[PDB]
Amino acid sequence: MEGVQEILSRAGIFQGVDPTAVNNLIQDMETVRFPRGATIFDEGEPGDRLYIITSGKVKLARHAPDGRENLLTIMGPSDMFGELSIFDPGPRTSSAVCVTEVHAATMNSDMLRNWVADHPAIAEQLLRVLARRLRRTNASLADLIFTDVPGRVAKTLLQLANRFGTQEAGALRVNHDLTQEEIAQLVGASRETVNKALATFAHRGWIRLEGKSVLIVDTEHLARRA
Amino acid sequence: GVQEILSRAGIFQGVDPTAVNNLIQDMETVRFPRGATIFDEGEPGDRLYIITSGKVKLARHAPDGRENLLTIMGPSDMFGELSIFDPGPRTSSAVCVTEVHAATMNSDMLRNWVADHPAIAEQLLRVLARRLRRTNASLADLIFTDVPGRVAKTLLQLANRFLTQEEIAQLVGASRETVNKALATFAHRGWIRLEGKSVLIV
């Protein structure tokens, strides 16, 4: 249906790819839905399925023997996950759990081989997608090593707003729905450290802290801090 | 053998060996003096380098203008590799520790290289994924593993072949007040040895 296939076409994997080929793969894709709280996969599990959300929220968490788990990200419409599986079938690098009911469409490595075979020119476009992904994954590594807590709070707030923000009267209302601990986990620091940084941010007039939402009043200043 | 050194490149792991050689013969060789910057953070980038001899440090600009060292690389290492699939501004500086010799290609060569060997396209998507696989593996550990464990990781990774005091602790991620006390404990167990910018591993 138009809107659902509109949502799908927006995914990273299709960004800057041949529009006709994108249409082609979209109609070959299988739909799935999952209920609220459903587990899609567990970290460690073998996989060969890439998911593109068309509706609802999935969280990806990282785990450990000691130092249990850590929210990695939260994802919504047009986002994809599990993409590694279809390029390098192997074990899942995270967990994926449904925060709400979720509707998605999926593919596996075969559908991908067939796809490229049909539209060879897209291999170059998909390498660009795979590299853009890399650019981002190394960045989060660098930030975690070198940026300070306030800085990474600033980053995390901006990243959530890019993905889940509402333009509101010159500001951006971010409706993440996360505990203080989860924000800490995204930032990679302690509930306490992260909460101070937030408070200093409010005190500066850059943000207003309201329930489980953040109103970013001063993007420029907050960004410069990031 | 420059070819062999070049053949040990991550970009080439598990790709058609004839497709690999065809490109090697056709890559440009380049040389830089000691100290020279190859590229600066934020300049338009479009070139992959593979080191054939010498050492290159990669770093990002820090606040207060300070220095943030991301990695040291020697023969067979490649930097700028992402600019070749996804042009645009460089995300680090690459600076020559010694005199440097290296081979290069641009995205313009890479387009022609796939169009000549469509077999590779999939092998190249696998490479990137494997690298992607590796970086998260690094991220998990970083949020989880102890600085000693991460100083042990940096030590083992650089030891492939056998940086100041405030440069190793950048690689590792935490304080030099932590990285050093991690390093001393290792030496007390008799694992490694001081000597200056030099370390001996057992």
Residue numbers in the entry:
A (entry chain A): 1 to 226
B (entry chain B): 3 to 164, 178 to 217
Structure paper excerpt:
GlxR from C. glutamicum (Cg-GlxR) has been identified as one of the central regulators of the Corynebacterium metabolism and more than 200 genes under GlxR control have so far been identified. Cg-GlxR, which shares a sequence identity of approximately 29% with CRP from E. coli (Ec-CRP), is a protein of 227 amino acids (compared to 210 for Ec-CRP) comprising an N-terminal dimerisation and ligand binding domain, and a C-terminal DNA-binding domain. Once activated by cAMP, the regulator interacts with its target pseudo-palindromic DNA sites with the consensus sequence 5-TGTGANNTANNTCACA-3′ located in the regulatory region of Cg-GlxR controlled genes.
In order to shed further light on the activation mechanism and the structural and dynamic basis of allosteric regulation in the CRP/FNR family we determined the crystal structures of apo Cg-GlxR at a resolution of 2.5 Å. Chain A shown on the left-hand side in blue is well defined with residues 1–226 (out of 227) present in the model, chain B (green) shows a larger degree of flexibility, and hence the model contains residues 3–164 and 178–217. The loop region of residues 165–177 that forms part of an anti-parallel β-sheet shows no density and was consequently not included. The two independent protein chains in the apo Cg-GlxR structure adopt a similar conformation with an rmsd of 1.36 Å for 200 equivalent Cα-atoms (all least-squares superpositions were calculated using the RAPIDO server). All Cg-GlxR structures form symmetric homo-dimers. While apo Cg-GlxR is clearly more flexible compared to cAMP-bound form as indicated by partially disordered loops in one of the two independent DNA-binding domains the structural change caused by cAMP binding depicted in Figure 2 is smaller than observed for other members of the CRP/FNR family. Nevertheless, there is a significant movement changing the position of the DNA-binding helix in monomer A with respect to monomer B by up to 10 Å (measured by comparing equivalent Cα-positions of the DNA-binding helix in monomer B). This motion is more than enough to render the apo Cg-GlxR less suited for DNA-binding.
